[PDB]
Structure 1
Amino acid sequence: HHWGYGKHNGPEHWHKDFPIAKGERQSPVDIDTHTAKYDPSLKPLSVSYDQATSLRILNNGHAFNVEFDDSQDKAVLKGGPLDGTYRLIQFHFHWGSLDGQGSEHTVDKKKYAAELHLVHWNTKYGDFGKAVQQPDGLAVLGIFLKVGSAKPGLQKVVDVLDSIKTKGKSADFTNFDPRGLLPESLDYWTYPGSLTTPPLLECVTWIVLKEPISVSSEQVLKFRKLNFNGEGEPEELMVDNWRPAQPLKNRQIKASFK
């Protein structure tokens, strides 16, 4: 039936309905640090989230999305390997049932507790829908999460998940600053790829930060309290909604640092 994250509808079944699952630039992938090469030509990465305008948090049945208002240049990603401007439309996470797994991209095979993804779409294409029909239409900033000390700027998100336990629910989540989710350093690895959930469109330029942020056990815990099911249905906790690393094939990962 509908794609999910189980023994019967998980990643290993996605290709049947979504053939591109075995494509040439699928994500995520394992980042081999001793093979990625520093690129002296990458321009400084620019992440301008000052005028960000969050509007709503939504449980879509496989994760929760904090949607932003992108009808104007408010929150934009640029610089790095990107040409032009990319607008922040939404950010979501991928986590595990255990701190030992959860992230999608892996560093030298190491799996993080979770992984944050801020999705932006190339403004040169007018809108998200049109952007997802281009080789360079999207730009996703990936940030790893590791369990330890709590992340202040992430608590609003934590406290609100209670109101959106089940699939379909969506609470007003206005005025959330995504800057509180950015690690200190901006060093990153970048490669051409796709979205990690069906339709798995290969339209993404991945910008994966090396420095992970650390959240508390109590925080990630509440992420694990969510449900994949809809209200009034057998409870399936929302855990392990991450896709495993896919073949790198004929791609190269460039490091923004030496």
Structure 2
Amino acid sequence: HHWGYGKHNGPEHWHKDFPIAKGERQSPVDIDTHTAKYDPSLKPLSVSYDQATSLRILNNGHAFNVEFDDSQDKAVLKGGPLDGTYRLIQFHFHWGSLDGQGSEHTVDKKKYAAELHLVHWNTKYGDFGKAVQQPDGLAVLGIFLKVGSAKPGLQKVVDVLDSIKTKGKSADFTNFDPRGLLPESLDYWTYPGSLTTPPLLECVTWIVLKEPISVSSEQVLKFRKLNFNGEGEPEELMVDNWRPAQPLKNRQIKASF
């Protein structure tokens, strides 16, 4: 009886195996844009993905992960609200059964169709597994997806999905450039939070871009053809793999703009 998104193992049950689910800095949150404070001391976000080395794409039974080479100083995030240098390790998405839901963060209660998370770890801690034990261990860049015009930079991901339909399946996935997933503007909101899946560790500086990217109906439809089950098991479509908004508690959301 493992965690998941279903009626019997979803977000409302996670606290039994992961008490920190009811903690003081859980994610995601609703971003109330009128209460977010503009902070002129915030720096532009520096996204340096020119040398990124993707390696593989994996269905982990919750989402799909695009994994990177994080053994050298390639694909880093810095500036913004961050101190020091955070290295990209992987990206993944959360999405809905319908276009009207799927994001984890919300903006004045608006749900987007999906949300991309680019996960980075603070190089001060030497690798990811040590970083997640620290309050400033990770930086997750969150980007909303809306349904409209296709995102040509996403198509390479979409097209490989049929090769990893089921949990545990992986495919070589080299030479994918995550710059093709970014909107034009890097304006953002930021706050201290957590992983949005178990183990729900309170280690993340969240950086959520204001501008969504557009993907097509057909692209998201292919995300919703994935399966949460393994091969040879009854089919459970991979949809609604998002945790809803958690209490803000003693936090402030800051705006770069």
What's the TM-score once normalised by structure 1's chain length? 0.99
The whole-number CA distance in structure 2 between the counterparts of 1:204 and 1:228 is 26
The whole-number CA distance in structure 1 between the counterparts of 2:214 and 2:114 is 10
Name the structure 2 match of 1:172: 172
Deviations 1:92-142 (CA, angstroms, capped at 9, x unpaired): 000000000000000000000000000000000000011011000000000
Once the two structures are TM-superposed, the CA of residue 245 in structure 1 deviates from its matched residue by 0.1
The whole-number CA distance in structure 1 between the counterparts of 2:209 and 2:114 is 13
Query: 2:14 touches 2:21 (CA, 8 Å); kept in 1?
Result: yes
Q: Which runs of 5+ in 2 are unaligned?
A: none
The whole-number CA distance in structure 2 between the counterparts of 1:255 and 1:46 is 16
The whole-number CA distance in structure 2 between the counterparts of 1:200 and 1:140 is 13
Deviations 1:22-69 (CA, angstroms, capped at 9, x unpaired): 000000000000000000101111000000000000000010000000
Secondary structure at the aligned position of 2:44 is classed as strand
The whole-number CA distance in structure 2 between the counterparts of 1:208 and 1:100 is 19
Name the structure 1 match of 2:156: 156
Name the structure 2 match of 1:110: 110
Question: What is the percentage of aligned positions where both structures have the same residue?
Answer: 100
The whole-number CA distance in structure 2 between the counterparts of 1:130 and 1:227 is 31
Give 4+ residue runs of structure 1 displaced > 4 Å after superposition.
none
Query: 2:183 touches 2:212 (CA, 8 Å); kept in 1?
Result: yes
The whole-number CA distance in structure 1 between the counterparts of 2:80 and 2:233 is 45
The whole-number CA distance in structure 1 between the counterparts of 2:243 and 2:200 is 11
Paired residues for 1:127-142 under 5 Å: 127-142=127-142
Task: Please provide the CA RMSD for this pair.
Answer: 0.3
The whole-number CA distance in structure 2 between the counterparts of 1:44 and 1:97 is 35
Deviations 1:188-242 (CA, angstroms, capped at 9, x unpaired): 0000000100001110000000000000000000000000000000000000000
Aligned length: 257
The whole-number CA distance in structure 2 between the counterparts of 1:17 and 1:240 is 21
Deviations 1:148-182 (CA, angstroms, capped at 9, x unpaired): 00000000000000000000000000000000000
Secondary structure at the aligned position of 1:179 is classed as helix
What's the TM-score once normalised by structure 2's chain length? 1.00
Name the structure 2 match of 1:9: 9
Once the two structures are TM-superposed, the CA of residue 82 in structure 1 deviates from its matched residue by 0.2
The whole-number CA distance in structure 2 between the counterparts of 1:153 and 1:80 is 24
The whole-number CA distance in structure 1 between the counterparts of 2:45 and 2:238 is 33
The whole-number CA distance in structure 1 between the counterparts of 2:218 and 2:91 is 21
The whole-number CA distance in structure 2 between the counterparts of 1:118 and 1:195 is 12
Query: 2:44 touches 2:186 (CA, 8 Å); kept in 1?
Result: no
Name the structure 1 match of 2:46: 46
The whole-number CA distance in structure 1 between the counterparts of 2:227 and 2:161 is 10
Query: 2:118 touches 2:142 (CA, 8 Å); kept in 1?
Result: yes
The whole-number CA distance in structure 2 between the counterparts of 1:239 and 1:145 is 15
Secondary structure at the aligned position of 1:43 is classed as coil
The whole-number CA distance in structure 1 between the counterparts of 2:102 and 2:250 is 26
